[PDB]
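Regression test attached.
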Amino acid sequence: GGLTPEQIIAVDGAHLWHPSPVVAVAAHGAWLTLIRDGQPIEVLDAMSSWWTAIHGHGHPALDQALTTQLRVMNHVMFGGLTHEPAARLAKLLVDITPAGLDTVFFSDSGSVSVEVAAKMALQYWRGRGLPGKRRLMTWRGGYHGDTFLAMSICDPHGGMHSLWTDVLAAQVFAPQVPRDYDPAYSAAFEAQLAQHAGELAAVVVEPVVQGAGGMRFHDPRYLHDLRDICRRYEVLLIFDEIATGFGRTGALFAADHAGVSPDIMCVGKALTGGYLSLAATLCTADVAHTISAGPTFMANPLACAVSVASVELLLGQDWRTRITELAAGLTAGLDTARALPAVTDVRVCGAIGVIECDRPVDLAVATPAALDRGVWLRPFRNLVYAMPPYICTPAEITQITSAMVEVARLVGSL
Amino acid sequence: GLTPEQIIAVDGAHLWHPSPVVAVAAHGAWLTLIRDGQPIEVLDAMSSWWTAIHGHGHPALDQALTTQLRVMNHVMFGGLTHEPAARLAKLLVDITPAGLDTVFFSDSGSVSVEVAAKMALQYWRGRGLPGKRRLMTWRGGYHGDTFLAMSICDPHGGMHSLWTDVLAAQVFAPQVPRDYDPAYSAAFEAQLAQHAGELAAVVVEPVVQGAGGMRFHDPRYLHDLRDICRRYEVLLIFDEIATGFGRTGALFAADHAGVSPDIMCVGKALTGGYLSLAATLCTADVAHTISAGPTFMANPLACAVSVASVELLLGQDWRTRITELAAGLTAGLDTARALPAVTDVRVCGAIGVIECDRPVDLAVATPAALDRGVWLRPFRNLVYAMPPYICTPAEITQITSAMVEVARLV
Ligand SMILES: *Cc1c(COP(=O)(O)O)cnc(C)c1O
Ligand SMILES: *Cc1c(COP(=O)(O)O)cnc(C)c1O
C-alpha cells in the first residue's frame, strides 16, 4: 500500500500479466503523468487510452456524475430491480442510435456485448423455427473481442485462429473489404452469402473503420450493400460499433455515414468517457419480441451514471464541428509523412489518423521516441496511429502529429 | 431526471433484464425501493448477488474511489502500469492459496473463466501436448454466461439441448454429493482417466456451487480432485467468483481443504460490490510455460476500491464475524426444518438456504418478503440469502424470519 514507482514496477514484473511498462501516476484532460527515469513527465494521451477518453481524463461533469451517483447508490442487482441511471442511458441510446433499435442489454465489456449480439441472432432464428441459422459471416481484417465466440469472427490471420483451430467455431469469411467502392466486391460477398444463407444467423462487421484488425477504412456504400443483401437473403445484420461509436469517425455512429440501421448493434469503449467498463447491445423490436415469444454487474448504476453524463456532454456541444477540426488538424499534421521512405499510406477519418509503414514498427524505439516528444503513442504491427481526445487543441494535435511523423521517420531512418 | 413511474415506463419499453421494482438508494445493508409509489427501506438479503459484503456506500470504499478519481480514472494497461493494479495484485497473491503468484485482470467473472480456460489450453501447448483441449467438471455448476463458460455450466440448467453444436462438448461427472463418499471420488478418477490425454483441466466451484442450486459439498472432495489432477497431469481450476473473500467461513473456500488449484478465478465481492472487476491467478509454472487483454483491463478505479474493500476485510477479524452470521442463520432457519414443503435447510458460513419440494412462485414470494422489510430473490425451489457481513443479529433475524415465511407459503 502506497508504493514508489520502483516498487510498482517491482510488483508488476513479478505479479502482473499485461495485454518495460511505464508507471502512470496521473491523468487530467488530454495528458498523462508518466514516470521516466525517476522523474514525472506530462505527455499527450494520443490513443485516448485505447479509444475511451473522448472528453479527456477527469472531466468535471463526469467526475461529478460519478460522485453524485456514489452518494445515492453504488450498485443493485438488475434481476428484479431497475433504476434511473439504466433507464436514462437506455432512453438516450435508443434515441441517438440508428433508427429501429428499441431494446438495450447492458454488459461489462465489449467482448461480452458481442457474445450477447450473437446470442440474440441465434435465439431469434430459433424463435422463428429456423435453428439451422447458427453460423456467422464477416469480412476479413476485423476484430470483435477476445472471448472464444468473439475470436471466431476476428481475422483468422491476426487473431491466430491456427493456434486455436478446432477450439473456435468455423465462421464464414469474405475477402478483406477494399477502401474504394467496387460493386464487384459486393456482388461476390452476395454470391458467397447465398451459398450459406440457410445456415447463417447474421453478418457481423465493424462499419466504416476496422480498428484492431489494421486501422482500415472502407467506403460507407458497402454497408448499404450489406443491408440490402441481408434483407434479401433473410440474414440479420450486426454492426460492431464498440470502437466507432460516439463521434469517432466524424458521424455519431459510423453506420450514419451510410444511413443504414443494423438489426443488432454493439457499443462500448467511449460509452463511459473512459472511466469504467460498460458495454451495450441493442436490437430491434422484432428481434426482441421474437426472442421473447445476465452479468453480475449488469447495468451498474455508477457506470451508467457517468455514461449518461458523457453522452449528454457530447450531444450538448457541437461535436460534429469539433471532429471536423480534429480531422483537418490530423490531415495537416500528417501530410509531411507521405513523402517519407518507409511510409506506404497516410489516412484520416474523423478523429483517427494512421501512418502505414513498410515494416513492423519497433516498440522499443517508437515508445521512447514519442515520449521524448511529450506524446504517449502505442503503434501496432506496421501502423503509427492516433485517436486523440475530442478536447485536444490545435496545438496539441500538432504536437501529436509531429511525434507520429518523427516515429515514422525513425522507422525508415535505420 | 425521471420519476419512478417514468423509470418503469422507460424500462418496460427499452430495457432487457436477467415488472422490476425501482431502486432509488442503497446504504449499508439496506436498499430503498419504491412500492405503491412510496420509498421503503428493505434489507439486501442477497447482498446484491454476492457483491455487497461490507454493505453499500461504505465510507472507506467511497473515499477510496473518490481519492483515485481525483488523480487518474483510467489508463490503458498496454505498456503502462499503475499503483492500484500493483497494490491489488500484491494483496491477491498474498491472500490466495499458496503458489498462485501471477494475476490477470478482467472486467467480469465470465471473462476471467474464459481467461482461465485459455491459460490451461496454452499451457499444454507450451508443453507439446495440444491434444489437451477439453475441460472436465461435475454437474450442478455455474461459471458464467459467455459461450465458453456455458460449456461447463450444468447441462440441464443451461438448456444444452437447445444450444446443440454451438457449445464445446465437455466432460461431466455426476453431481458431487453433500456428504463425503470415497466411491464418488474413485468414480471421478475413472472417468477422468479415460480422457486424461484429452483434458487440459478440471474446473469446479469449491465447497459451494452457487447459481447452479446452492449446493454444498465436503471439502475433502477438493483434496481428491487435487490429488487426481496431479497424478493424471490435468490442471485444476477453482472458480471462487462467488465463494471468495470469506463468504464460506474461510478467506477462500479452497482453504477449507488446504489445497491450491493451478488456476483460480475471483470476482463479485472483489470490489465490495461497487464496480465490475475480476481476476484470474495462476502459478509460476503455468505463467512461465505459457510465455515461453480487455479494453478496461486493470481499471484504476475498480482496482482502487478493491484494495480498500480487501484491506477492510483483512483488517477486522472477519472470521469470527462470519461464524456469528452462520450461527444467526442457523438459529433463524431451523424452524423451517419442520415445514411441509421443506426438503432441506443448510447453512455454510454467511450463506443460508431453505430448499423446498416445488418451484417458488415469485409473484407471491417477492411481495411477501417486502412486507417484512426484506429484498429476497428465490430461484427454482430455493429460498436463500447471503447477507452483507455487516448485518447485525436483529437484521439476520428479520432476514431469516422472512425466509421461513416465504417457505411456509408452500
Ligand atoms: C457470478 C459467477 C460467474 C460469472 O460472473 P459474471 O461477472 O456474472 O460474468 C462465474 N462463476 C461463478 C461461480 C459465479 O458465481
Ligand atoms: C475493443 C473492441 C472490442 C472488445 O472490447 P473489450 O471491452 O476490450 O472486451 C470489440 N469490438 C471492437 C470493434 C473493439 O474495438
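Expected vs. actual: identical. Residues 394-413 of chain A form the longest helix (20 residues).
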